[PDB]
């Protein structure tokens, strides 16, 4: 029976009962491409990987029997798609298993910036005591009224559409920018569309990123573009860490051009408050890249990935695959 | 005439309005025993926040008081019936922070399901998470919102605002209110129950939005807290006297309640090192600031000042717009 390896992981309690009568399961709990066992590089047919490991063209050439790679999640920017197609390797993913979980987490961060709640809870644990009304107005200074504000969205995908529907119930005014969509998509949802990125930044009070990390949008929020935003705006990022230049963001927070920022993904992971360009920056909220986790979502995505492997082994590639992302490049 | 601010020091907004019709003064008092003797003899009107309580004995010490205006929506700290007999009118600002309080309630609900305050707190303590297995452990307990049931106690101004916003996330909404008419749920497309016990049996998250009258003190007592489901949430942003904190602490420790978010407490100011909730897991607290906003603060202060001016240059209670003791007034 063939061999299937989990590149970065130790727990295989869900995949084992599915792939037990058709293949052999193994794990390697690796943190880099140099920690992969020699047996895997010679006798592996399929592989499963999370977002914690990156594969390049040189790494792919070291495999001698790999035929399919399945990514547990929705992002595949850490795999060289074009190079794998030339070598004859198919890449798959799970498109939508945590659409609603990520949309709810985005709304939670937006409300924390307007109605300051994490900062107020943090102050009480430090020992701050507030008794009079004047003290209340000072500790919670900066809260604003949501109704009448403008919300800007970059990338109207699965998550982007979910956020737009929930934001209208609070009184927001929604704009979006997407250059790869057809005409009339905004008519169905009753939204407003702009044509340039600069126009979106001029008329927005809160900016959220929901696009993908291709090769034409690296460091989208750079030093030049961060000066085109309004005076005292917010920024929420939950898509990818490579879309924001953290060095330029830190200077904006100190000078006061940006009132606050909530981040879930960073350029360098794992994140620590004592290291990096954001070592000492006021008005910052960070989470350890957990905007997708749920009890139901975790089980659903692991079972779907396991069944994709079984179809490939007992079928034909890529006719039997449902979610293939390098079909054009495959030869 | 003389107008006094019982508990406050800042009068930059009320002064330009009440400058050509009365004399403004402040006391900055924290108790009824810290009021100056001149106020007790030569005061026509008064302004007060929620930080001071007046009883019948306190009211009898005033010799010229005619009107009391409460800056806010709650008036449970003033003896309404006793003031009516003495010939004193009580007013308030009904709706100036309806939407601010509704947004704050939704923020607390999302923090319990999608754990965000606790995850941010862990990072500041120095916790480091690198592998996926570590992520599943630190954030263990998150759930899926769609398909859950939300229970609301008291469908008022704030209660209706919360219900509309909760339907966009996929919640199923029930409510309990014994003082409403028939068919209110038909207009909003909600579901209504008839008893408090029935609401607790079929709810996964309970929010309090009622008023603090004399028939609902310690509504969530020891007996009722055992009728809730296994592993439910609790959000309180109305008043501190509706929840028995001694019984709540035991439920959190044993695990019958997964978490609780509180904005108002029985004893204020609140401190994590004192009280029955000194050591209780899964707790979120805020310093009674679910109403503050830059626009809301200015709006409520101007409205209260103009209510005083109408009373002085008019007749009581014909010229008053928001009077709460009109029936008891003689």
């Amino acid at each position: 029976r063939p061999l299937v390896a989990l590149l970065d992981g130790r727990d295989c309690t869900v995949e084992m009962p599915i792939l037990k009568d058709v293949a052999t399961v193994a794990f390697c709990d690796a943190q880099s491409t140099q920690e992969i066992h020699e047996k895997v590089l010679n006798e592996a047919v399929g592989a499963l990987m999370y977002h914690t490991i990156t594969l390049t063209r040189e790494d792919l050439e070291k495999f001698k029997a790999l035929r399919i790679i399945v990514r547990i999640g929705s992002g595949f920017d850490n795999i060289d798609i074009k190079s794998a197609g030339d070598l004859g390797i198919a890449v798959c993913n799970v498109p939508a298993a945590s659409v609603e979980e990520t949309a709810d987490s985005t709304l939670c961060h937006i409300l924390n910036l307007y109605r300051r709640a994490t900062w107020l809870h943090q102050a009480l644990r430090e020992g701050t005591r507030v008794q009079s009304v004047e003290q209340i107005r000072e500790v919670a200074s900066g809260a604003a009224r949501i109704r009448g504000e403008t919300l800007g969205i970059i990338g109207l995908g699965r998550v982007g559409q979910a956020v737009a529907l929930r934001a209208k119930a609070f009184g927001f005014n929604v704009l979006f920018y997407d250059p790869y969509l057809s005409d009339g998509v905004e008519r169905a949802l009753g939204l407003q569309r702009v044509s340039t990125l600069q126009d979106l930044l001029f008329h927005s009070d809160c900016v959220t990123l929901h696009c993908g990390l291709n090769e034409h949008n690296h460091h989208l929020i750079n030093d030049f573009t961060v000066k085109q935003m309004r005076q005292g705006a917010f920024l929420v990022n939950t898509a990818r860490g490579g879309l924001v230049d953290e060095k330029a963001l830190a200077q904006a927070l100190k000078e006061g051009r940006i009132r606050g920022a909530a981040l879930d993904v960073h350029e360098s992971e794992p994140f620590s408050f004592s290291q990096g360009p954001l070592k000492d920056a006021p008005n910052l909220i960070c989470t350890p890249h957990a905007a997708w986790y749920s009890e139901q979502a975790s089980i659903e995505m692991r079972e779907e990935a396991a069944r994709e492997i079984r179809r490939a082994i007992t079928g034909r590639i890529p006719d039997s695959l449902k979610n293939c992302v390098n079909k054009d490049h495959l030869t | 005439p003389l107008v006094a601010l019982l508990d406050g020091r800042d009068c930059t907004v009320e002064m330009p309005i009440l400058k050509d019709v009365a004399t403004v003064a402040f006391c900055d008092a924290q108790s009824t025993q810290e009021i100056h003797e001149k106020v007790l003899n030569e005061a026509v009107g008064a302004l007060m926040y929620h930080t001071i309580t007046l009883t019948r004995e306190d009211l009898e010490k005033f010799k010229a008081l005619r009107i009391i205006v409460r800056i806010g929506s709650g008036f449970d700290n003033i003896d309404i019936k006793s003031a009516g007999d003495l010939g004193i009118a009580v007013c308030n600002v009904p709706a100036a922070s309806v939407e601010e309080t509704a947004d704050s309630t939704l923020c607390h609900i999302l923090n319990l399901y999608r754990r965000a305050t606790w995850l941010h707190q862990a990072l500041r303590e120095g916790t480091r998470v690198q592998s996926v297995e570590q992520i599943r452990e630190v954030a263990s307990g998150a759930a899926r919102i769609r398909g859950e049931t939300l229970g609301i106690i008291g469908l008022g101004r704030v209660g209706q605002a919360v219900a509309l916003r909760a339907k966009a996330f996929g919640f199923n909404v029930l409510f309990y209110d014994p003082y409403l008419s028939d068919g209110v749920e038909r207009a909003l497309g909600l579901q209504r129950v008839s008893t408090l016990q029935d609401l607790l049996f079929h709810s996964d998250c309970v929010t309090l939005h009622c008023g603090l009258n004399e028939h609902n003190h310690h509504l969530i007592n020891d007996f009722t807290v055992k009728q809730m489901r296994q592993g439910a949430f609790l959000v309180n942003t109305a008043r501190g006297g509706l929840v028995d904190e001694k019984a709540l602490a035991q439920a959190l420790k044993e695990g019958r309640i997964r978490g609780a978010a509180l904005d108002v407490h029985e004893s204020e100011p609140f401190s994590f090192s004192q009280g029955p909730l000194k050591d209780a897991p899964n707790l979120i607290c805020t310093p009674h600031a679910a109403w503050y906003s830059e626009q809301a603060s200015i709006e409520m202060r101007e409205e209260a000042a103009r209510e005083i001016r109408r009373a002085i240059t008019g007749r009581i209670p014909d010229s008053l717009k928001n009077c709460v003791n009109k029936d008891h007034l003689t």
Partner: peptide, 22 residues
């Protein structure tokens, strides 16, 4: 029964119960 091909058997992950097996 998953085969443990954890060649670089390092300890950068303390993720669960304390192992007190003899």
């Amino acid at each position: 029964e998953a085969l443990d091909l954890s060649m670089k058997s390092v300890p950068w992950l303390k993720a669960g119960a304390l192992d007190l097996s003899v």
